Amino acid sequence: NLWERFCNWVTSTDNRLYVGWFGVIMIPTLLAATICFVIAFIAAPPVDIDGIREPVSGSLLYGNNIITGAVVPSSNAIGLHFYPIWEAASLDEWLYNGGPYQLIIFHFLLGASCYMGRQWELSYRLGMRPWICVAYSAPLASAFAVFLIYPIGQGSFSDGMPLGISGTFNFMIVFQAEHNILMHPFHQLGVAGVFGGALFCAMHGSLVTSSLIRETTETESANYGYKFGQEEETYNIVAAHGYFGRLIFQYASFNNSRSLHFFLAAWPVVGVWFTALGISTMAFNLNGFNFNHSVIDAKGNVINTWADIINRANLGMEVMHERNAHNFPLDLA
Amino acid sequence: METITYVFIFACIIALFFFAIFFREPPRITK
Amino acid sequence: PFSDIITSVRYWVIHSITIPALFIAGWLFVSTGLAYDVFGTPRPDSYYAQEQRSIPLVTDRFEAKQQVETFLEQLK
Amino acid sequence: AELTPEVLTVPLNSEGKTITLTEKQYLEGKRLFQYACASCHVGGITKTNPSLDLRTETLALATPPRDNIEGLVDYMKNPTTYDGEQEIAEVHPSLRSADIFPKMRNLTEKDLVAIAGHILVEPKILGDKWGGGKVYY
Amino acid sequence: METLKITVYIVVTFFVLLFVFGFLSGDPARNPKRKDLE
Amino acid sequence: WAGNARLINLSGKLLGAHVAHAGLIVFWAGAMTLFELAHFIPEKPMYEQGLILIPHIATLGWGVGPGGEVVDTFPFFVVGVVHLISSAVLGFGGVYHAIRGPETLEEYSSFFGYDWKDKNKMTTILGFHLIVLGIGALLLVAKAMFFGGLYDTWAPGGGDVRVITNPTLDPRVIFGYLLKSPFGGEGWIVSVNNLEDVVGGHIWIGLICIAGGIWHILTTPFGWARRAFIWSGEAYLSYSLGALSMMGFIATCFVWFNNTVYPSEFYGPTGPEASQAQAMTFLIRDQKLGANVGSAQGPTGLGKYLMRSPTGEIIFGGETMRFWDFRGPWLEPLRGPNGLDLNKIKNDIQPWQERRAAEYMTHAPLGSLNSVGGVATEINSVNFVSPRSWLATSHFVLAFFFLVGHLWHAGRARAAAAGFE
Amino acid sequence: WFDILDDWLKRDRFVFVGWSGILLFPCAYLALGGWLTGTTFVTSWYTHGLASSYLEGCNFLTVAVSTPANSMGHSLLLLWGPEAQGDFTRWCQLGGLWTFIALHGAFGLIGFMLRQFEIARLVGVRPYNAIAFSAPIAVFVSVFLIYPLGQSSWFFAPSFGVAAIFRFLLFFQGFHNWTLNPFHMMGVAGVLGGALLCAIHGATVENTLFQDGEGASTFRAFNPTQAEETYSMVTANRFWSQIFGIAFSNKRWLHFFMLFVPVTGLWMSAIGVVGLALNLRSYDFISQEIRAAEDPEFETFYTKNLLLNEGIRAWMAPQDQPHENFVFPEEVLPRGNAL
Amino acid sequence: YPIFTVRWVAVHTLAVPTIFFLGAIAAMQFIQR
Ligand code: CLA
Ligand code: CLA
Ligand code: CLA
Ligand code: CLA
Ligand code: CLA
Ligand code: CLA
Ligand SMILES: C=Cc1c(C)c2cc3nc(c4c5[nH]c(cc6nc(cc1[nH]2)C(C)=C6CC)c(C)c5C(=O)[C@@H]4C(=O)OC)[C@@H](CCC(=O)OC/C=C(\C)CCC[C@H](C)CCC[C@H](C)CCCC(C)C)[C@@H]3C
Ligand SMILES: CC1=C(/C=C/C(C)=C/C=C/C(C)=C/C=C/C=C(C)/C=C/C=C(C)/C=C/C2=C(C)CCCC2(C)C)C(C)(C)CCC1
Ligand SMILES: CC1=C(/C=C/C(C)=C/C=C/C(C)=C/C=C/C=C(C)/C=C/C=C(C)/C=C/C2=C(C)CCCC2(C)C)C(C)(C)CCC1
Ligand code: OEC
Ligand SMILES: [Fe+3]
């Protein structure tokens, strides 16, 4: 009998949120991550990323400012293994081998995953379509790609992606010096998806703003809104479709509102869809292009193509990434 | 102290959350 | 364009003979070698003067022209 | 600035006689190098033993001498430690070790010669680079 | 710490049975806003 | 142009389509097998060219000697042809059933082939296809025990095709693999070391498939099952859809970390193989320069070559410390209690071991779209890309999109039940 | 004779050629041809040392139009420029193209915002779009003019190509640690925020569309009288409110805010660059550096990065900057052990 | 209907050069050394 009274609670509106079966995991999970994570950033002790005995400490108390960094990746020794708290000894240990990293990550992904489920489930209790579930799927998938797949493809969570601002940058740099991304279509479409969204989110909102109902209670001293009850909605779509059409050409402009908003959710999502793949594909070593040589068979004199000066920089960095943690000549992972 | 200041400005950004999400002005159809 | 000349035969007729006439006209632009001399884009024969391990650079703002020539006389 | 005869006028034996290769050959040299070498000898640098290269100068100091073709040919058939005291056939490609380096099974005298030629003409073209990878390092 | 490991698993599975048994649930099942088929 | 969605209910046309795309899958099987034995050159590392099925065919130890490319050429031509013709045998079928006429009104037919929303008939159709897998699975078993063996990469010498005897049929062992941590080296399905486990692990499936195929045949789903699941046609795709995704992942990761199943000899060396291979390659090199491996002290104080693993054994040091879980036929003989024996190392190390290290270490799975071999910085004079990176890469991709599919079609089954249709 | 032209010219045809139509098309055409021409036919190794076009065989990516030589400073070397002396072929050899493209192309951008103003006073719409467009124009001048001006010459300006741009990126990372600049950070904020909006807005709509609006149940219809439009704000609101926690529901704000994020961002980013033009950067944290030198057992990601940079700089500057003629002996180069 | 600035010029101004290049480029792909 009780069991029935509980479910009804979870299922409908609670005057704050909606916490369905999906948030039954999402809420306790994302909490453990938050708390742990906030504290790790304010006091975590140094952590030696690559097994080496050279601890890096990117926490507030240990001499950092916000940009300087945060929660550092597990050791390269525990690298790919499961490192819970119970599994170790003293926390002085745990804290050194990157525990916080794993703990925070895994809870976050799981609850991150469920935050997505929750999005759909709310749709089922409100009779609306299931799309928002899909558009979130892009970044989520990406987080996983960066936080999981790679360390899974590489052989150790260490060098997953630090939880600091600064290290984000590091991960990036090291990354293209090791796999050369810039020249990979999936990260190229990525810049397309993003620079896309920028150009469109500006375009739409720009036009939507220019073709407004010029005459609705808007004077030069006041500006007050609309509300669903408002039939004609805010703008004269004929003015916008007319505007844009006259700036380039008829086809160029969009006739109806579906093709407009569908585009807005299509471009970005399918751009990151790919990028998130990009990484996941270079997680197992299928690195970007690399046109290192173009010649003059005349003598075979090598001619440097713009791309070689790209390899000249990619080079300097390879050489010094993870200084003194290499004992053999060629990195293989 | 370089610290408390990054913390201080932190607690506010969370205090602002609570207050924004739980004490916001109503979105009503009374219109 | 709803397909306007896109359907008629005149459009194909006047281009079937026009477009493949530029397609070729261009091709011969490269086979003949005008590109190189009109644009001055050295050919594999002329990058390095056999055993001239240096890269032609440009130094003087006013002698660009006489400089460049100094480089073409060399290769010859 | 084209590929010239002199360029291909490479030393053939220790004393002083030389042979001038051709266009056809040169190219087969690469194709072969890439076939059973590059993998381990990319751009003329040992991956397995970085302190030993394939530059011309370092080959002359070998035992027996290797700045010429006959020497390389000998090496490809049967291997010789930089000093010439060990038989490294159970370790390095050798027509005598076909049974273990299948890529070698097909090879022929003509191909060794060409491969050898590729290794001696390259440096005249690439220079420092082919050595320790300058452009490459 | 072995005491900790145990405590966790209880907690975790606890909220699992609430996910699982929350769906198979004969009571709430798959009840929507537009149509209830029971 | 949801054309394929107009077909939803006219099962008479789906058969025409399902059996049309079912014809492509087999077509590819021939077009690729023949394309491969085409470009294929004998005695050159299968994987240094760019093959994928043949390696599968030699996996089943269909045509090979101790880790020797192929002694018998033919075995592949059979496969190339068969599947290429099965593509017509079905192309005919798919086309016909697609164009000559719909279904469901044939009385004797509806008795043999029913429709949707009918739990008892869907169930029955399901079990059917289950009786088929129960078989194909068991056939694999046949091909290892009473037929031309299977390729065991393990003990001894070269591990050519070998026939198995009394597969690990213990009830415990088989599901133990299911109950083990999917972390650090131990992935439930991937942990499979002994080839005999694999055989026995197939016997149980078939018995389980069949025992199930028949089960639903005779039984219609219970209440709990009825009130959890929906029954729209689109919804059964959502079930099946997401199932395949998981697996895409499954196999992908399964691909990168080899179990005897994927003998690294055809497929190439494992991401870790290369690294661990590079450590071993250099112990020897310096060992030959008289370097003492036990007292080595790398700039870190961890010894260049040897260090420990958290549980205290010996492992090659260097970043390759994260792959001490790695196990293969070459590195094992030096393995013993407490980790690697410092005494077998410098005393009992055969030459053929340096070879494998060097080869693998040399063909690192690392590659780019230009098929450039090695580090992102190398020169374009070396072509290679470990099959594994190809399988892992492409297949990951599909397992992802496909999941996007589990979301799209399953969320649309919520719109049929009452939402938007 | 005037007004007539006004009309003939401003006549509503397929492709609107307004008063601005005169700047826009001659410039935006030549700026395109200029690229495509050199891209396919010119070499820039007399001026840069690398391969510029297809004529030498670069892939699309590799091919580009390279910047003039550093020896020339900011002399706009136009065809009749005292330096080219009217000889076209050389005017190209020297890179006189870059200047071409940037100048004509600068005006095409001028024309395009002008054409955006015209159309708004003919149709009677708001000028807003024309204003949103300033961001890119800022970014452009910021980048291709201001920056090269502040520095040694035209050479250092981005190069007109694909890879030639990636190289730009990296260049910045090494000598400027542009990633640490806060301005690029905000810029990085709006661009990613533009795409975040573009998804939620577009998905929310599409998914909150009115039920049964189409019996067939696909969604390819509308009309003018369809005043109410195809979806609910009331449901979205509650959707968000209960999932994310917040949701200002007032369509007019939603769209404007969508102007603020992207555009507000690029202006910063452009500011950030006017700064680097003067080698004025955010490349250092005195506080850290100090304790970084008095103590060797202390390291943060801040530091690890500064190391990569020097690697970028040492290895990449002698081939990348031919004019100073850097000679760097193997030993000298910074280098981690074993690599 | 007639020939006009808009329709007419626009198209050939962009569209004609293209095939000249595509023609030139097509020629490139076969060149040696
Ligand atoms: C100022 C000129 C300029 C130009 C023209 C480009 C152009 C480009 N850049 Mg570069 N860039 C520039 C400056 C420039 N950049 C600067 C200053 C920097 C900083 C140093 C960069 C940094 C940069 C990076 C880091 C990257 C690029 C990339 C790209 C490519 C991106 C493709 C894309 O999706 O874009 C976004 C735009 C869109 C998605 C839409 C453009 C509009 C199209 C053409 C409309 C098509 C519509 C059709 C005609 C009509 C249909 C009608 C409809 C009704 C049906 C593109 C070729 C990326 C790449 O992939 O490189 C190869 C990449 O990764 N750029
Ligand atoms: C199990 C297999 C499967 C099946 C049988 C279906 C079946 C169906 N889907 Mg679903 N889908 C699937 C998986 C599947 N899907 C997956 C994994 C995803 C996630 C990506 C989707 C996403 C999806 C969406 C988003 C939609 C559908 C829709 C539909 C219906 C579409 C009818 C149609 O218009 O097709 C037309 C199909 C196409 C034009 C195909 C485009 C394919 C890409 C562009 C090709 C890429 C190839 C590339 C060129 C190759 C390069 C070469 C390579 C060597 C490198 C149909 C019921 C539609 C619907 O409304 O459902 C009711 C719809 O909108 N599906
Ligand atoms: C995966 C592959 C695939 C498959 C199997 C189908 C299958 C089908 N589609 Mg779909 N479709 C697809 C992809 C696919 N589609 C994609 C990607 C799109 C988006 C572009 C569409 C868009 C679409 C639309 C818009 C429509 C369909 C329709 C149909 C049905 C047509 C039946 C018919 O008789 O047509 C007529 C048949 C022909 C013209 C004959 C084709 C003959 C083939 C090529 C012969 C091959 C040779 C043969 C094997 C030789 C055998 C010889 C023997 C000796 C061995 C059919 C079930 C239609 C429908 O309404 O269905 C309900 C429809 O209107 N589809
Ligand atoms: C996915 C697997 C698959 C499946 C499940 C099926 C399933 C089926 N197939 Mg298909 N098939 C497949 C693959 C598959 N096929 C492939 C790959 C091929 C190509 C090799 C074919 C080729 C194929 C053919 C050629 C035929 C079928 C038929 C059938 C149906 C047979 C049932 C039966 O009892 O027939 C037993 C047969 C009968 C009861 C025949 C009765 C004869 C009719 C009524 C005569 C009408 C003539 C009359 C005198 C006219 C008077 C007119 C007046 C104006 C003079 C069944 C639905 C048959 C069918 O659909 O026909 C009923 C059929 O003929 N299949
Ligand atoms: C082809 C695949 C297949 C499919 C789609 C189904 C589908 C179904 N089965 Mg059937 N089943 C199968 C195979 C299959 N079965 C086999 C092979 C057997 C023999 C053991 C059975 C035995 C069986 C029984 C005894 C019963 C069902 C029941 C059901 C229904 C259950 C409702 C439900 O899912 O509740 C929710 C589901 C769960 C809580 C289970 C989640 C399980 C995960 C996803 C899979 C774990 C798989 C395993 C670890 C992998 C093997 C690894 C290998 C290395 C050994 C459903 C229609 C019930 C029924 O229809 O009642 C009359 C029922 O009582 N099935
Ligand atoms: C071929 C066999 C194989 C397969 C199929 C997998 C599969 C998987 N691996 Mg494993 N792996 C393998 C071999 C394999 N691995 C090997 C050999 C190694 C040795 C190095 C590893 C090392 C490894 C690591 C280091 C990691 C993985 C992870 C993962 C998961 C990633 C997807 C995800 O985010 O799920 C999210 C979860 C689901 C979709 C749940 C499916 C189960 C049912 C249907 C739902 C239960 C619902 C409830 C809410 C959750 C309870 C979960 C419980 C743990 C608390 C996936 C299940 C990652 C992970 O997240 O660990 C588990 C990870 O970090 N693997
Ligand atoms: C990848 C980067 C990016 C590109 C390529 C891009 C492109 C474009 N944006 C336009 C518009 C806009 N973009 C807008 C906001 C944004 N646009 C953004 C980012 C981009 N926008 C961002 C981030 C925003 C947010 C602020 C707005 C608000 C608008 C418009 O109103 C307008 C439009 O109508 O929308 C579609 C179009 C203007 C055409 C024109 O004025 O020609 C005139 C000038 C020309 C042709 C050349 C000038 C010369 C320049 C220097 C040369 C460029 C030549 C290249 C180097 C050669 C080709 C190179 C290849 C690699 C592609 C054009 C398609
Ligand atoms: C798109 C589409 C579709 C589909 C289609 C399909 C699905 C198809 C299929 C097809 C198929 C499935 C096919 C197959 C084919 C095959 C063939 C055509 C074969 C051939 C062969 C031969 C010729 C042989 C070979 C050989 C041998 C065996 C031996 C040696 C030599 C040789 C090489 C000669 C449909 C209708 C639905 C609708 C519309 C659209
Ligand atoms: C310099 C000059 C001039 C002239 C010139 C011009 C103006 C030009 C132009 C030119 C041009 C204008 C050119 C062009 C070319 C082009 C090309 C060659 C193209 C191609 C393309 C393609 C191949 C495409 C494709 C695709 C696909 C397939 C898919 C995806 C998408 C796309 C679309 C990308 C004058 C006398 C005035 C004076 C000054 C100087
Ligand atoms: Mn974090 O990292 Ca994949 O590259 Mn080589 O191995 Mn370790 O060095 Mn860097
Ligand atoms: Fe909108």
From Swiss-Prot, chain B:
The chain crosses the membrane at residues 3-23. Residues 1-2 are lumenal. Keywords: Formylation, Membrane, Photosynthesis, Photosystem II, Thylakoid, Transmembrane, Transmembrane helix. Residues 24-31 are cytoplasmic. The lineage of its organism: Bacteria, Bacillati, Cyanobacteriota, Cyanophyceae, Acaryochloridales. PSII is composed of 1 copy each of membrane proteins PsbA, PsbB, PsbC, PsbD, PsbE, PsbF, PsbH, PsbI, PsbJ, PsbK, PsbL, PsbM, PsbT, PsbX, PsbY, PsbZ, Psb30/Ycf12, PsbO, CyanoQ (PsbQ), PsbU, PsbV and a large number of cofactors. It forms dimeric complexes. Part of a photosystem II (PSII) assembly intermediate complex PSII-I; crystallized from a strain deleted of psbJ, it forms monomeric PSII before addition of the oxygen evolving complex. PSII-I includes 3 assembly factors not found in mature PSII (Psb27, Psb28 and Psb34). GO terms for biological process: photosynthesis. Belongs to the PsbT family. It is found in: Cellular thylakoid membrane. Found at the monomer-monomer interface of the photosystem II (PS II) dimer, plays a role in assembly and dimerization of PSII. PSII is a light-driven water plastoquinone oxidoreductase, using light energy to abstract electrons from H(2)O, generating a proton gradient subsequently used for ATP formation. One of its GO terms (cellular component) is photosystem II reaction center. It holds the Pfam family PsbT. It comes from Thermosynechococcus vestitus (strain NIES-2133 / IAM M-273 / BP-1). The gene is psbT. It is a single-pass membrane protein. Disulfide bonds: none annotated. HAMAP family: PSII_PsbT. InterPro entries: PSII_PsbT, PSII_PsbT_sf.
Swiss-Prot record, chain D:
Its cofactor is heme c. GO terms for molecular function: electron transfer activity; heme binding; iron ion binding. Disruption phenotype: Cells do not grow photoautotrophically under low CO(2) concentrations. Coiled coil: none annotated. It is found in: Cellular thylakoid membrane. GO terms for biological process: photosynthesis, light reaction; respiratory electron transport chain. The keyword Coiled coil does not apply. Keywords: Electron transport, Heme, Iron, Membrane, Metal-binding, Photosynthesis, Photosystem II, Signal, Thylakoid, Transport. Disulfide bonds: none annotated. It is a peripheral membrane protein. Heme c binds at H41, H92. One of its GO terms (cellular component) is photosystem II. Binds 1 heme c group covalently per subunit. PSII binds multiple chlorophylls, carotenoids and specific lipids. One of the extrinsic, lumenal subunits of photosystem II (PSII). PSII is a light-driven water plastoquinone oxidoreductase, using light energy to abstract electrons from H(2)O, generating a proton gradient subsequently used for ATP formation. The extrinsic proteins stabilize the structure of photosystem II oxygen-evolving complex (OEC), the ion environment of oxygen evolution and protect the OEC against heat-induced inactivation. Low-potential cytochrome c that plays a role in the OEC of PSII. Belongs to the cytochrome c family. PsbV subfamily. This is Photosystem II extrinsic protein V. It comes from Thermosynechococcus vestitus (strain NIES-2133 / IAM M-273 / BP-1). The lineage of its organism: Bacteria, Bacillati, Cyanobacteriota, Cyanophyceae, Acaryochloridales.
Curated annotation (Swiss-Prot), chain E:
InterPro entries: PSII_PsbI (IPR003686), PSII_PsbI_sf (IPR037271). The chain crosses the membrane at residues 3-24. PSII binds multiple chlorophylls, carotenoids and specific lipids. The modification N-formylmethionine is found at M1. Residues 25-38 are cytoplasmic. It is a single-pass membrane protein. It is found in: Cellular thylakoid membrane. One of its GO terms (biological process) is photosynthesis. Disruption phenotype: Decreased yields of PSII dimers with increased PSII monomers, slightly slower photoautotrophic growth, about 20% less oxygen evolution. Formed PSII dimers are stable. GO terms for cellular component: photosystem II reaction center; plasma membrane-derived thylakoid membrane. Residues 1-2 are lumenal. It holds the Pfam family PsbI. Keywords: Formylation, Membrane, Photosynthesis, Photosystem II, Reaction center, Thylakoid, Transmembrane, Transmembrane helix. NCBIfam families: PRK02655.1. HAMAP family: PSII_PsbI (MF_01316). PANTHER family: PHOTOSYSTEM II REACTION CENTER PROTEIN I. PSII is composed of 1 copy each of membrane proteins PsbA, PsbB, PsbC, PsbD, PsbE, PsbF, PsbH, PsbI, PsbJ, PsbK, PsbL, PsbM, PsbT, PsbX, PsbY, PsbZ, Psb30/Ycf12, peripheral proteins PsbO, CyanoQ (PsbQ), PsbU, PsbV and a large number of cofactors. It forms dimeric complexes. Part of a photosystem II (PSII) assembly intermediate complex PSII-I; crystallized from a strain deleted of psbJ, it forms monomeric PSII before addition of the oxygen evolving complex. PSII-I includes 3 assembly factors not found in mature PSII (Psb27, Psb28 and Psb34). Belongs to the PsbI family. This is Photosystem II reaction center protein I.
Swiss-Prot record, chain H:
Its cofactor is heme b. GO terms for biological process: photosynthetic electron transport chain. One of its GO terms (molecular function) is electron transfer activity. The chain crosses the membrane at residues 6-30. Heme binds at H12. Residues 31-33 are lumenal. It comes from the Bacteria. Keywords: Acetylation, Electron transport, Heme, Iron, Membrane, Metal-binding, Photosynthesis, Photosystem II, Thylakoid, Transmembrane, Transmembrane helix, Transport. It is found in: Cellular thylakoid membrane. With its partner (PsbE) binds heme. PSII binds additional chlorophylls, carotenoids and specific lipids. Coiled coil: none annotated. GO terms for cellular component: photosystem II reaction center; plasma membrane-derived thylakoid membrane. It is a single-pass membrane protein. The keyword Protein biosynthesis does not apply. Its main location: membrane. Belongs to the PsbE/PsbF family. Heterodimer of an alpha subunit and a beta subunit. PSII is composed of 1 copy each of membrane proteins PsbA, PsbB, PsbC, PsbD, PsbE, PsbF, PsbH, PsbI, PsbJ, PsbK, PsbL, PsbM, PsbT, PsbX, PsbY, PsbZ, Psb30/Ycf12, peripheral proteins PsbO, CyanoQ (PsbQ), PsbU, PsbV and a large number of cofactors. It forms dimeric complexes. Part of a photosystem II (PSII) assembly intermediate complex PSII-I; crystallized from a strain deleted of psbJ, it forms monomeric PSII before addition of the oxygen evolving complex. PSII-I includes 3 assembly factors not found in mature PSII (Psb27, Psb28 and Psb34). This is Cytochrome b559 subunit beta. It comes from Thermosynechococcus vestitus (strain NIES-2133 / IAM M-273 / BP-1). The gene is psbF.
